[PDB]
């Protein structure tokens, strides 16, 4: 019953994130392929992606539930084709901003990817499905990652052909999304009131708050983990190591996500326990990622953080899906990702951006670990409040 939609969406998400260009993205548009300077790739190109992500998530959670979650995925698939098509044959920064915009489209519609399956499978499978979905996505990345590595370590494949393989993968993902089964069917203040009815669920607003907050710190860690590794071990070869470790970490997260789907354990009573334990694990790993000036210890801490957070976000998505009791799967997922991106952008402005505090990378992860520890303690003091 649930096997065909789950398998098709898992194949889509695998081929929509099996992107060998992703680990070698910055070298691709900063090397001979595009000849863009590094001060226009991060101060003018990536903020465009962030802004497009915000303004494209804004109509995702509003409209994805109404359109039954397939067109936004199909819009994600087509915009994957546009993103990497302009990433392949678009020179200069004028076209690359448009690509950052379409990648914001694909990332905002990635909310539809997660929320579609809960609108097409019964709640009983919401655990298993969840894991698998998240797992395959993470598997996707690490697959692409390791694939990319081999293509640059054994076949000297140029970054342009890495992006070509990425486009071919997301093209197969678009074809799989075309074959996704269509889910069955089903002023402003009222809409907000509906959101209030959609957010008054049991053990969901707190999982939502974790999603709205912990994933912002996770995305900050994702962005600046390579910079932390460069600070810890300024090695010329470390690059091939760095992304590779991400692969393993992502792979770990994959299996961690694959854990949540596979284990026949009840998160109804262990949801709070899993939240507390693995949020404390994330905080401790982030502190370990910073406090210990050992590159191998930092890699292990990053693997632990990524795997535990992937497990936690899988539990969060599953628990929100079962406890939602409203058809708006992508509204809560979409607004969760939008609020998380808002918090991530705000803490990027303060923590690392020149406009804010501009904290060096040797205290960046200190404050990231402090942020995750604050999140965990908030969910510590919630358990004590429950008593
Ligand atoms: C398709 C090319 C456009 C594009 N590709 C990859 C990223 C990856 N990235 C970069 C910085 C911060 C976060 C993330 C996910 C990006 N922002 N933009």
Residue boundaries of the structural domains of the chain: 1-182, 187-387
Instruction: Compute the distance from residue 313 Cα to the ligand 1 centre, in Å.
Output: 21
Domains 1-182 and 187-387 share a fold: yes
Name the token pair of 348. Answer: 């990027």
Q: Which of 377, 29, 375 is nearest to 220 (CA)?
A: 375
* Alpha carbon nearest to ligand 1 atom 18, residue: 100
Number of C-beta neighbours around residue 348 at 10 A: 19
Q: How far apart are CA 199 and CA 196, in angstroms?
A: 5
- Which atom of ligand 1 is nearest the CA belonging to 29? 2
Name the token pair of 266. Answer: 């009840």
* Alpha carbon nearest to ligand 1 atom 15, residue: 223
Pocket of ligand 1 (CB under 6 A): 22, 25, 46, 49, 83, 87, 99-100, 103, 223
Q: Which of 269, 275, 302 is nearest to 368 (CA)?
A: 302
What DSSP letter does each residue of 229-275 carry, written as one string?
HHHH---STHHHHHHHHHHHHHHHHHHHHHHHHH----HHHHHHHHH
Residue 129 burial by Cβ neighbours in a 10 Å radius (0-12, 13-18, 19+): buried
Phi, psi of 265, deg, nearest 5: -105, 145
Phi, psi of 358, deg, nearest 5: 60, 60
CA distances from 336 to 143, 280, 342 (A): 27, 21, 10
Q: Residues before each break in the chain (C–N > 2.5 Å)?
A: 186
Place of tokens 């680990």: 23
Q: How was this structure determined?
A: cryo-EM
Q: What is the 3-state secondary structure (H, E, C) of 185-230?
A: CCCHHHHHHHHHHHHCCCCCHHHHHHHHHHHHHHHHHHHHHHHHHH
Resolution, angstroms, 1 dp: 3.1
The answer to whether 69 and 330 are in contact (CB under 8 A) is: yes
CATH topology of domain 187-387: Growth Hormone; Chain: A; (1.20.1250)
- Region class of 37: left (phi > 0), else alpha (psi between -120 and 50), else beta: beta
Measure the CA dihedral 213/289/245/117, to 10°: -20
Domain 1-182, CATH number (from 1.10.760, 3.40.30, 1.20.1250, 3.40.1710): 1.20.1250
What does the radius of gyration of the chain's CA atoms come to, in whole angstroms?
20
């Amino acid at each position: 019953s649930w096997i065909y939609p789950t398998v098709i969406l898992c194949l889509f998400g695998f081929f929509s994130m099996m992107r060998p260009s992703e680990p070698f993205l910055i070298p691709y548009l900063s090397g001979p392929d595009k000849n863009l300077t590094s001060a226009e790739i991060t101060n003018e190109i990536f903020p465009v992606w962030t802004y497009s992500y915000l303004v494209l998530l804004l109509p995702v959670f509003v409209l994805t539930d109404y359109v039954r979650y397939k067109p936004v995925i199909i819009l994600q698939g087509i915009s994957f084709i546009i993103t990497w098509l302009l990433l392949l044959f678009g020179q200069g920064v004028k076209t690359m901003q448009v690509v950052e915009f379409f990648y914001g489209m694909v990332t905002a519609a990635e909310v539809a990817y997660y929320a579609y399956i809960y609108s097409v499978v019964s709640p009983e499978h919401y655990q298993r499905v969840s894991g698998y979905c998240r797992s395959v996505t993470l598997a996707a990345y690490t697959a692409g990652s390791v694939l990319a590595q081999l293509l640059v370590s054994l076949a000297n494949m140029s970054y342009f052909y890495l992006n070509v393989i990425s486009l071919a993968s997301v093209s197969v993902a678009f074809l799989f999304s075309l074959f996704l089964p269509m889910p069955k069917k089903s002023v402003f203040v009222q809409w907000f009131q509906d959101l209030k009815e959609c957010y008054s669920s049991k053990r969901l607003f707190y999982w939502s708050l974790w999603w709205a907050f912990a994933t912002a710190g996770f995305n900050q860690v994702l962005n600046y983990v390579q910079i932390l590794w460069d600070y810890k071990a300024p090695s010329q070869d470390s690059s091939i190591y760095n992304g590779a470790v991400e692969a393993i970490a992502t792979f770990g997260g994959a299996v961690a996500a694959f854990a949540v789907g596979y284990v026949k354990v009840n998160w109804d009573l262990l949801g709070e326990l899993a939240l507390v334990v693995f949020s404390v694990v994330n905080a401790g790993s982030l502190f370990l990622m910073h406090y210990t000036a050992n590159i191998w210890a930092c890699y292990a801490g990053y693997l632990i953080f990524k795997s535990s957070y992937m497990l936690l976000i899988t539990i969060a998505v599953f628990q929100i899906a079962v406890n939602l009791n409203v058809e708006r799967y992508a509204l809560v997922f979409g607004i969760n990702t939008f609020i998380a991106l808002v918090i991530q952008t705000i803490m990027t402005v303060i923590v690392v951006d020149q406009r804010g505090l501009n904290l060096p990378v040797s205290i960046q992860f200190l404050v990231y670990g402090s942020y995750f520890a604050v999140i965990a303690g908030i969910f510590l003091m919630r358990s004590m409040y429950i008593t």
